[PDB]
A and B are shown apart, each in its own frame.
Chain A
Amino acid sequence: EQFKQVFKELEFLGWYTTGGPPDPSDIHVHKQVCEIIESPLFLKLNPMTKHTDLPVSVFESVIDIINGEATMLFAELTYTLATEEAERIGVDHVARMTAENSTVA
C-alpha cells in the first residue's frame, strides 16, 4: 500500500533470495509467497559461483502431475538483456569512472 502510490504500473511479481541452489527452505518460502499471486518468480543471486550454471538465475514453480503427494518443481527460466538507451548510457557512465585499491591496479 505504501509503494502503490509511487509506482502506479508496478504490482507484485515474486521474491528474491541470495544463496546457493534452490533448497527446501526456498520452496518452503515459495509455498507462502504463492498465496499472493498465481505464479511468483524467484531470483537467486550467488556471488560464489565457480560452476557451469550462471551465478544469477530465475526460477518458476511448476505444479508436477505426479500422483499422491506432489512436490512442485522449480524450473529455471532464461532472461534477456533488454535495456533502455538512457539507463544503458547511465551504467556506461558509471562504469567509465573509477574510484583502498590502487588506481593503476
Chain B
Amino acid sequence: FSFKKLLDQCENQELEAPGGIATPPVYGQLLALYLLHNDMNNARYLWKRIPPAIKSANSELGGIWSVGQRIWQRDFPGIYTTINAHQWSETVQPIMEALRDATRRRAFALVSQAYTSIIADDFAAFVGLPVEEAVKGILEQGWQADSTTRMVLPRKPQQLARLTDYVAFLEN
C-alpha cells in the first residue's frame, strides 16, 4: 500500500546523503517510524548511529530516545506518560498520536492473549485509558465483567498445478 511506498521513500532518503549524515528532522522521523513498527533493534542502532554532537544539540532526539527506552523495557503505562512529556513537530503531529493508537492495540493483544483474569487497575494501566475503556470491554466487545472484585475476564478470539509440479519434480 502507500505505507510501502513511504518506507521506500525513507529508504531513498537514507541511501544518499551529503556526508552520510542527514537532516535532524528526517533522522527523528526515521527513529519514530522504527519505534512505530516495533523494529527496536534498528531503532537503537540508529540512535547510536547519530553523532554525539548533533545528538546533544537537539532535545527532540532525546525525547524520541526516551520513548524508545520506555517501549524497549515494555513498560506499557509509562509509554503514554513519556509520549506526552514533549511536543512533537507539526509535520509529525497527527502521525505520532497514531503511533499511540498502535501501542493501544498492542496492549489490547497483550490482554486478550496471555491473560485469563486481569486486575482492572493493571488493565487500565496497560491500555492507558483510565476507567472508560473497561466499559468498552463489556458493552461493545462482549466480555462479562463483575463488580466488587475488579476482575476483568478477557475472552480469547491453483492447487492442481502445484501437485502437478510436485509429481513432475519427483518423476524426473
Point out the residues of chain B lying under 8 angstroms from A2, CB to CB.
none
The complex places the Cα of A103 from the Cα of B163 at a distance, in Å, of 12
Point out the residues of chain B lying under 8 angstroms from A104, CB to CB.
163-164, 167-168, 171
Near B by CB (< 8 A), chain A positions 68-105 give 102-104
The complex places the Cα of A104 from the Cα of B168 at a distance, in Å, of 7
B74-102 vs A, CB cutoff 8 Å, 1 = contact: the mask equals 00000000000000000000000000000
Q: How many A-B residue pairs have CB under 8 A?
A: 10
Size of B's binding interface in residues, CB under 8 A? 5
Point out the residues of chain B lying under 8 angstroms from A103, CB to CB.
167, 171
The complex places the Cα of A102 from the Cα of B164 at a distance, in Å, of 11
Point out the residues of chain A lying under 8 angstroms from B167, CB to CB.
102-104
The complex places the Cα of A50 from the Cα of B167 at a distance, in Å, of 33
Point out the residues of chain A lying under 8 angstroms from B164, CB to CB.
104
- Which residue of A has the minimal Cβ distance to B166? A104
Point out the residues of chain A lying under 8 angstroms from B171, CB to CB.
102-104
B132-172 vs A, CB cutoff 8 Å, 1 = contact: the mask equals 00000000000000000000000000000001100110010
- Which residue of B has the minimal Cβ distance to A104? B167
The complex places the Cα of A103 from the Cα of B167 at a distance, in Å, of 8
A10-30 vs B, CB cutoff 8 Å, 1 = contact: the mask equals 000000000000000000000
7 extra interchain contacts, Cβ-Cβ under 8 A, other than A102-B168, A102-B171, A103-B171?
Answer: A102-B167, A103-B167, A104-B163, A104-B164, A104-B167, A104-B168, A104-B171
10 A-B Cβ contacts within 8 A?
A102-B167, A102-B168, A102-B171, A103-B167, A103-B171, A104-B163, A104-B164, A104-B167, A104-B168, A104-B171
Closest 7 CB pairs of A and B: A104-B167, A104-B164, A103-B171, A102-B171, A104-B168, A103-B167, A104-B171
